[PDB]
PDB file of C-alpha atoms and ligand atoms in Angstrom:
ATOM      1  CA  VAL H   1       0.000   0.000   0.000  1.00 31.25           C
ATOM      2  CA  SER H   2       1.277   3.425  -0.996  1.00 30.97           C
ATOM      3  CA  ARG H   3       1.095   6.305   1.488  1.00 30.56           C
ATOM      4  CA  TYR H   4      -0.113   9.715   0.354  1.00 30.39           C
ATOM      5  CA  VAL H   5       2.802  12.066  -0.232  1.00 28.16           C
ATOM      6  CA  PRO H   6       1.774  15.744  -0.305  1.00 27.31           C
ATOM      7  CA  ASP H   7       2.475  17.685  -3.494  1.00 28.14           C
ATOM      8  CA  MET H   8       2.845  21.444  -3.933  1.00 30.64           C
ATOM      9  CA  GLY H   9      -0.612  23.008  -3.712  1.00 29.73           C
ATOM     10  CA  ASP H  10      -2.247  20.167  -1.787  1.00 31.23           C
ATOM     11  CA  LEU H  11      -4.476  21.100   1.128  1.00 31.21           C
ATOM     12  CA  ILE H  12      -3.921  18.600   3.914  1.00 30.37           C
ATOM     13  CA  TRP H  13      -5.286  17.773   7.333  1.00 27.63           C
ATOM     14  CA  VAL H  14      -2.897  16.816  10.096  1.00 27.89           C
ATOM     15  CA  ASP H  15      -2.334  17.253  13.826  1.00 25.17           C
ATOM     16  CA  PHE H  16      -0.596  20.178  15.537  1.00 28.08           C
ATOM     17  CA  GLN H  17      -5.581  15.533  22.439  1.00 29.63           C
ATOM     18  CA  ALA H  18      -7.075  16.474  19.063  1.00 32.07           C
ATOM     19  CA  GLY H  19      -4.661  19.112  17.772  1.00 28.10           C
ATOM     20  CA  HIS H  20      -5.358  18.427  14.097  1.00 30.89           C
ATOM     21  CA  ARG H  21      -6.189  21.176  11.595  1.00 27.38           C
ATOM     22  CA  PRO H  22      -5.815  21.954   7.843  1.00 27.00           C
ATOM     23  CA  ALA H  23      -2.843  23.325   5.925  1.00 23.13           C
ATOM     24  CA  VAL H  24      -1.444  23.681   2.398  1.00 24.18           C
ATOM     25  CA  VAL H  25       1.890  22.451   1.035  1.00 25.62           C
ATOM     26  CA  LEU H  26       4.358  24.912  -0.496  1.00 23.60           C
ATOM     27  CA  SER H  27       7.157  22.335  -0.764  1.00 22.19           C
ATOM     28  CA  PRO H  28       7.671  20.370  -4.025  1.00 20.53           C
ATOM     29  CA  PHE H  29       6.791  16.671  -4.201  1.00 19.56           C
ATOM     30  CA  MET H  30      10.371  15.381  -4.130  1.00 17.78           C
ATOM     31  CA  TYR H  31      11.384  17.325  -1.048  1.00 18.11           C
ATOM     32  CA  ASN H  32       8.239  16.279   0.783  1.00 19.80           C
ATOM     33  CA  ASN H  33       8.937  12.690  -0.226  1.00 22.36           C
ATOM     34  CA  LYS H  34      12.579  12.212   0.774  1.00 24.92           C
ATOM     35  CA  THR H  35      12.529  14.202   4.011  1.00 25.15           C
ATOM     36  CA  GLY H  36       9.064  13.223   5.179  1.00 25.05           C
ATOM     37  CA  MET H  37       8.836  16.958   5.812  1.00 26.80           C
ATOM     38  CA  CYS H  38       7.151  19.808   3.982  1.00 29.77           C
ATOM     39  CA  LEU H  39       6.672  23.567   4.005  1.00 25.80           C
ATOM     40  CA  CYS H  40       3.080  24.616   4.554  1.00 28.91           C
ATOM     41  CA  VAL H  41       0.826  27.345   5.913  1.00 30.02           C
ATOM     42  CA  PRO H  42      -2.073  26.702   8.324  1.00 34.32           C
ATOM     43  CA  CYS H  43      -5.676  27.324   7.306  1.00 35.28           C
ATOM     44  CA  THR H  44      -8.729  28.079   9.432  1.00 33.67           C
ATOM     45  CA  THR H  45     -12.424  28.894   9.117  1.00 33.19           C
ATOM     46  CA  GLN H  46     -11.954  31.975  11.298  1.00 32.63           C
ATOM     47  CA  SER H  47     -10.936  35.124   9.430  1.00 31.35           C
ATOM     48  CA  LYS H  48      -9.806  38.091  11.501  1.00 30.47           C
ATOM     49  CA  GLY H  49      -8.752  39.900   8.331  1.00 32.30           C
ATOM     50  CA  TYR H  50      -4.964  40.020   8.620  1.00 31.84           C
ATOM     51  CA  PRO H  51      -2.978  41.418   5.650  1.00 30.32           C
ATOM     52  CA  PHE H  52      -1.248  38.078   5.094  1.00 28.20           C
ATOM     53  CA  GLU H  53      -4.463  36.075   5.052  1.00 32.17           C
ATOM     54  CA  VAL H  54      -5.300  34.401   1.753  1.00 30.74           C
ATOM     55  CA  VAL H  55      -8.949  33.574   1.258  1.00 34.41           C
ATOM     56  CA  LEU H  56      -9.566  30.075   0.004  1.00 32.04           C
ATOM     57  CA  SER H  57     -12.699  29.764  -2.113  1.00 31.21           C
ATOM     58  CA  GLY H  58     -14.285  26.383  -1.512  1.00 30.20           C
ATOM     59  CA  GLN H  59     -17.327  24.636  -2.924  1.00 30.92           C
ATOM     60  CA  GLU H  60     -19.421  24.433   0.250  1.00 31.49           C
ATOM     61  CA  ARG H  61     -17.657  26.270   3.067  1.00 28.59           C
ATOM     62  CA  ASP H  62     -14.885  28.857   2.915  1.00 24.56           C
ATOM     63  CA  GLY H  63     -11.762  29.635   4.910  1.00 26.86           C
ATOM     64  CA  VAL H  64      -8.422  31.387   5.153  1.00 29.12           C
ATOM     65  CA  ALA H  65      -4.775  30.350   4.818  1.00 28.62           C
ATOM     66  CA  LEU H  66      -2.274  32.367   6.829  1.00 23.87           C
ATOM     67  CA  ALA H  67       0.772  33.059   4.672  1.00 23.42           C
ATOM     68  CA  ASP H  68       2.953  34.829   7.226  1.00 25.17           C
ATOM     69  CA  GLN H  69       2.827  31.600   9.205  1.00 23.51           C
ATOM     70  CA  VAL H  70       4.769  29.222   6.950  1.00 22.70           C
ATOM     71  CA  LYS H  71       6.361  26.445   8.980  1.00 24.77           C
ATOM     72  CA  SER H  72       8.229  23.199   8.451  1.00 24.44           C
ATOM     73  CA  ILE H  73       6.354  20.145   9.715  1.00 23.98           C
ATOM     74  CA  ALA H  74       6.841  16.418   9.393  1.00 24.16           C
ATOM     75  CA  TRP H  75       3.764  15.277   7.554  1.00 22.81           C
ATOM     76  CA  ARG H  76       4.675  11.602   7.388  1.00 26.05           C
ATOM     77  CA  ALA H  77       5.145  10.942  11.080  1.00 26.88           C
ATOM     78  CA  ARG H  78       2.230  13.300  11.681  1.00 30.74           C
ATOM     79  CA  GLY H  79      -0.368  11.436   9.625  1.00 29.61           C
ATOM     80  CA  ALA H  80      -1.051  14.081   6.999  1.00 29.39           C
ATOM     81  CA  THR H  81      -3.945  13.359   4.624  1.00 30.90           C
ATOM     82  CA  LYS H  82      -5.332  15.056   1.523  1.00 32.52           C
ATOM     83  CA  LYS H  83      -8.401  17.268   1.932  1.00 30.42           C
ATOM     84  CA  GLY H  84      -8.065  18.774  -1.553  1.00 34.00           C
ATOM     85  CA  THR H  85      -5.920  21.041  -3.727  1.00 30.65           C
ATOM     86  CA  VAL H  86      -5.828  24.836  -4.045  1.00 28.54           C
ATOM     87  CA  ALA H  87      -6.255  26.648  -7.357  1.00 29.91           C
ATOM     88  CA  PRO H  88      -2.961  27.824  -8.888  1.00 33.15           C
ATOM     89  CA  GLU H  89      -4.276  31.321  -8.179  1.00 31.75           C
ATOM     90  CA  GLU H  90      -4.551  30.837  -4.421  1.00 31.29           C
ATOM     91  CA  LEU H  91      -1.200  29.044  -4.428  1.00 31.78           C
ATOM     92  CA  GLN H  92       0.442  32.066  -6.029  1.00 31.61           C
ATOM     93  CA  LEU H  93      -1.295  34.701  -3.918  1.00 35.31           C
ATOM     94  CA  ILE H  94       0.166  32.786  -0.995  1.00 35.06           C
ATOM     95  CA  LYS H  95       3.753  32.788  -2.228  1.00 34.53           C
ATOM     96  CA  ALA H  96       3.602  36.384  -3.442  1.00 32.19           C
ATOM     97  CA  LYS H  97       3.113  37.420   0.176  1.00 32.67           C
ATOM     98  CA  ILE H  98       5.669  35.028   1.593  1.00 32.67           C
ATOM     99  CA  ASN H  99       7.977  36.686  -0.887  1.00 34.86           C
ATOM    100  CA  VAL H 100       6.798  40.037   0.496  1.00 35.90           C
ATOM    101  CA  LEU H 101       7.824  39.073   4.041  1.00 35.66           C
ATOM    102  CA  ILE H 102      11.042  37.677   2.574  1.00 33.53           C
ATOM    103  CA  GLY H 103      11.372  37.840  -1.225  1.00 35.40           C
ATOM    104  CA  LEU H 104      14.397  37.160  -3.398  1.00 35.76           C
TER     105      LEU H 104
ATOM    106  CA  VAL A   1      13.166  49.572  29.295  1.00 35.68           C
ATOM    107  CA  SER A   2      12.170  48.180  25.899  1.00 36.55           C
ATOM    108  CA  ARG A   3      12.596  44.579  24.757  1.00 32.93           C
ATOM    109  CA  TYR A   4      14.955  43.847  21.890  1.00 36.02           C
ATOM    110  CA  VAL A   5      12.955  43.253  18.724  1.00 36.32           C
ATOM    111  CA  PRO A   6      14.434  40.720  16.289  1.00 36.45           C
ATOM    112  CA  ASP A   7      15.130  42.182  12.868  1.00 36.55           C
ATOM    113  CA  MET A   8      15.731  40.723   9.424  1.00 35.25           C
ATOM    114  CA  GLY A   9      19.101  38.981   9.449  1.00 37.32           C
ATOM    115  CA  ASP A  10      19.512  38.859  13.222  1.00 35.35           C
ATOM    116  CA  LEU A  11      20.777  35.693  14.893  1.00 35.13           C
ATOM    117  CA  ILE A  12      18.852  35.030  18.094  1.00 33.24           C
ATOM    118  CA  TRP A  13      18.769  32.550  20.963  1.00 38.29           C
ATOM    119  CA  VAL A  14      15.430  30.947  21.769  1.00 40.31           C
ATOM    120  CA  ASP A  15      13.665  27.976  23.392  1.00 39.27           C
ATOM    121  CA  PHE A  16      12.320  25.353  20.958  1.00 40.37           C
ATOM    122  CA  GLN A  17      20.267  20.321  25.934  1.00 37.24           C
ATOM    123  CA  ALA A  18      21.628  22.108  22.866  1.00 35.71           C
ATOM    124  CA  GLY A  19      19.829  25.144  24.205  1.00 34.30           C
ATOM    125  CA  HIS A  20      16.669  24.758  22.170  1.00 35.74           C
ATOM    126  CA  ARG A  21      18.823  26.506  19.717  1.00 35.75           C
ATOM    127  CA  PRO A  22      19.556  29.840  17.993  1.00 36.01           C
ATOM    128  CA  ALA A  23      17.849  30.837  14.770  1.00 34.93           C
ATOM    129  CA  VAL A  24      18.332  33.365  11.998  1.00 36.82           C
ATOM    130  CA  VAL A  25      15.474  35.836  11.612  1.00 37.09           C
ATOM    131  CA  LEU A  26      14.023  36.262   8.129  1.00 33.71           C
ATOM    132  CA  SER A  27      11.176  38.626   9.079  1.00 37.06           C
ATOM    133  CA  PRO A  28      11.372  42.445   8.956  1.00 36.76           C
ATOM    134  CA  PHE A  29      11.402  44.459  12.182  1.00 35.65           C
ATOM    135  CA  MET A  30       7.835  45.680  11.825  1.00 37.06           C
ATOM    136  CA  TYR A  31       6.188  42.281  11.400  1.00 36.84           C
ATOM    137  CA  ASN A  32       8.196  40.914  14.301  1.00 39.18           C
ATOM    138  CA  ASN A  33       7.347  43.999  16.346  1.00 41.17           C
ATOM    139  CA  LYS A  34       3.630  44.268  15.614  1.00 42.62           C
ATOM    140  CA  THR A  35       2.913  40.532  15.570  1.00 40.61           C
ATOM    141  CA  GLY A  36       5.185  39.334  18.351  1.00 38.75           C
ATOM    142  CA  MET A  37       6.103  36.553  15.956  1.00 36.60           C
ATOM    143  CA  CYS A  38       8.760  36.074  13.303  1.00 35.41           C
ATOM    144  CA  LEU A  39       9.960  33.834  10.503  1.00 32.40           C
ATOM    145  CA  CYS A  40      13.346  32.257  11.165  1.00 28.39           C
ATOM    146  CA  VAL A  41      15.332  29.139  10.378  1.00 30.09           C
ATOM    147  CA  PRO A  42      17.045  27.013  13.051  1.00 32.73           C
ATOM    148  CA  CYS A  43      20.842  26.835  13.373  1.00 33.03           C
ATOM    149  CA  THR A  44      23.025  23.974  14.556  1.00 36.89           C
ATOM    150  CA  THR A  45      26.734  23.300  15.111  1.00 38.17           C
ATOM    151  CA  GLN A  46      26.300  19.808  13.689  1.00 39.13           C
ATOM    152  CA  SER A  47      26.337  19.484   9.915  1.00 39.17           C
ATOM    153  CA  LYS A  48      25.389  16.579   7.670  1.00 40.77           C
ATOM    154  CA  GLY A  49      26.401  18.426   4.499  1.00 40.11           C
ATOM    155  CA  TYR A  50      22.831  18.587   3.182  1.00 42.15           C
ATOM    156  CA  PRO A  51      21.491  20.577   0.178  1.00 43.58           C
ATOM    157  CA  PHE A  52      19.653  23.162   2.277  1.00 40.56           C
ATOM    158  CA  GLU A  53      22.473  23.805   4.742  1.00 39.16           C
ATOM    159  CA  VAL A  54      23.982  27.292   4.764  1.00 41.27           C
ATOM    160  CA  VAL A  55      27.309  27.920   6.461  1.00 42.18           C
ATOM    161  CA  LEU A  56      27.431  30.879   8.817  1.00 41.31           C
ATOM    162  CA  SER A  57      31.082  31.760   9.359  1.00 45.18           C
ATOM    163  CA  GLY A  58      31.929  32.835  12.888  1.00 44.69           C
ATOM    164  CA  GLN A  59      35.065  34.389  14.349  1.00 43.99           C
ATOM    165  CA  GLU A  60      35.903  31.583  16.789  1.00 46.16           C
ATOM    166  CA  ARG A  61      33.778  28.768  15.341  1.00 45.86           C
ATOM    167  CA  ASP A  62      31.383  27.942  12.499  1.00 45.45           C
ATOM    168  CA  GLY A  63      27.799  26.765  12.151  1.00 49.14           C
ATOM    169  CA  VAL A  64      24.919  26.107   9.791  1.00 50.26           C
ATOM    170  CA  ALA A  65      21.400  27.438   9.224  1.00 47.14           C
ATOM    171  CA  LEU A  66      18.817  25.013   7.887  1.00 48.38           C
ATOM    172  CA  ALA A  67      16.951  26.817   5.137  1.00 49.49           C
ATOM    173  CA  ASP A  68      14.222  24.262   4.452  1.00 49.12           C
ATOM    174  CA  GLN A  69      13.204  24.275   8.110  1.00 48.12           C
ATOM    175  CA  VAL A  70      11.967  27.865   8.252  1.00 49.51           C
ATOM    176  CA  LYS A  71       9.156  28.433  10.719  1.00 46.46           C
ATOM    177  CA  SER A  72       6.959  30.978  12.463  1.00 44.90           C
ATOM    178  CA  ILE A  73       7.515  31.057  16.207  1.00 47.30           C
ATOM    179  CA  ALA A  74       6.321  33.489  18.835  1.00 53.17           C
ATOM    180  CA  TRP A  75       9.440  35.184  20.062  1.00 53.16           C
ATOM    181  CA  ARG A  76       8.111  37.661  22.613  1.00 51.56           C
ATOM    182  CA  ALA A  77       6.496  34.845  24.571  1.00 51.09           C
ATOM    183  CA  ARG A  78       9.342  32.436  23.768  1.00 50.04           C
ATOM    184  CA  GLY A  79      11.948  34.935  24.962  1.00 50.25           C
ATOM    185  CA  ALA A  80      14.244  35.616  22.016  1.00 53.03           C
ATOM    186  CA  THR A  81      17.565  37.424  22.504  1.00 50.42           C
ATOM    187  CA  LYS A  82      20.136  38.741  20.036  1.00 55.67           C
ATOM    188  CA  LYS A  83      23.283  36.640  19.582  1.00 55.98           C
ATOM    189  CA  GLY A  84      24.595  38.661  16.648  1.00 56.36           C
ATOM    190  CA  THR A  85      23.893  39.294  12.966  1.00 55.49           C
ATOM    191  CA  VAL A  86      24.514  37.197   9.855  1.00 53.48           C
ATOM    192  CA  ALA A  87      26.484  38.616   6.930  1.00 53.06           C
ATOM    193  CA  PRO A  88      24.544  40.156   4.019  1.00 56.32           C
ATOM    194  CA  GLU A  89      25.684  37.248   1.833  1.00 60.34           C
ATOM    195  CA  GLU A  90      24.744  34.685   4.479  1.00 60.39           C
ATOM    196  CA  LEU A  91      21.200  35.984   4.887  1.00 60.59           C
ATOM    197  CA  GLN A  92      20.911  36.257   1.106  1.00 62.25           C
ATOM    198  CA  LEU A  93      22.102  32.693   0.531  1.00 61.38           C
ATOM    199  CA  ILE A  94      19.446  31.526   2.988  1.00 61.16           C
ATOM    200  CA  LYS A  95      16.558  33.259   1.202  1.00 62.84           C
ATOM    201  CA  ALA A  96      17.609  31.802  -2.155  1.00 60.52           C
ATOM    202  CA  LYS A  97      17.553  28.259  -0.777  1.00 58.31           C
ATOM    203  CA  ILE A  98      14.015  29.014   0.405  1.00 58.99           C
ATOM    204  CA  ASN A  99      12.654  30.140  -2.962  1.00 58.70           C
ATOM    205  CA  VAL A 100      14.606  27.230  -4.390  1.00 60.52           C
ATOM    206  CA  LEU A 101      12.307  25.175  -2.186  1.00 59.74           C
ATOM    207  CA  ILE A 102       9.301  27.285  -3.161  1.00 60.84           C
ATOM    208  CA  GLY A 103       8.526  28.989  -6.475  1.00 59.48           C
TER     209      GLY A 103
HETATM  210 NA1   NA S   1      12.258  41.167  31.703  1.00 58.04          NA
END
């Protein structure tokens, strides 16, 4: 049986007891695969309207991904699963910020 | 008195036996200041020679920042302090490795 390995753009659920919430992977498939780690930003239903928030437009519900919050996590050990995939738009809005906080 | 506020490029000591180690701060002063949180990557004296390692060259000794491991931590609460500042090239090399990891 072949475990799910997050790919760039995937929205995943994982634990941070019940500490598990959603996030989205900014780290390319290979990296995620070899290291059992990935770069991602956390998402939540609650929107307080921070500058670095990126709205995610969903079918049924809707939520926000916090782009200032990028963090390295170990998805493998942490039981990360696939809740969906963000539109290339959302993906890029995300990065564009993260570049803002950091950039080239 | 007014707490030190980590700035872009600063090397800080934090709490994550190795000291719950230092990190290099990739966030600008403002964000760090207003938010009470920052983006940084962890540093270690150990090195495995991995693709995302970045050497930080010290006077007495040398170390490495791990560029793939960047994270948001809450420094005010977690009690960050300033251990020094990375070289312009060092900080730059870090950022590149990051966007190398992310388009
Ligand atoms: Na004090």
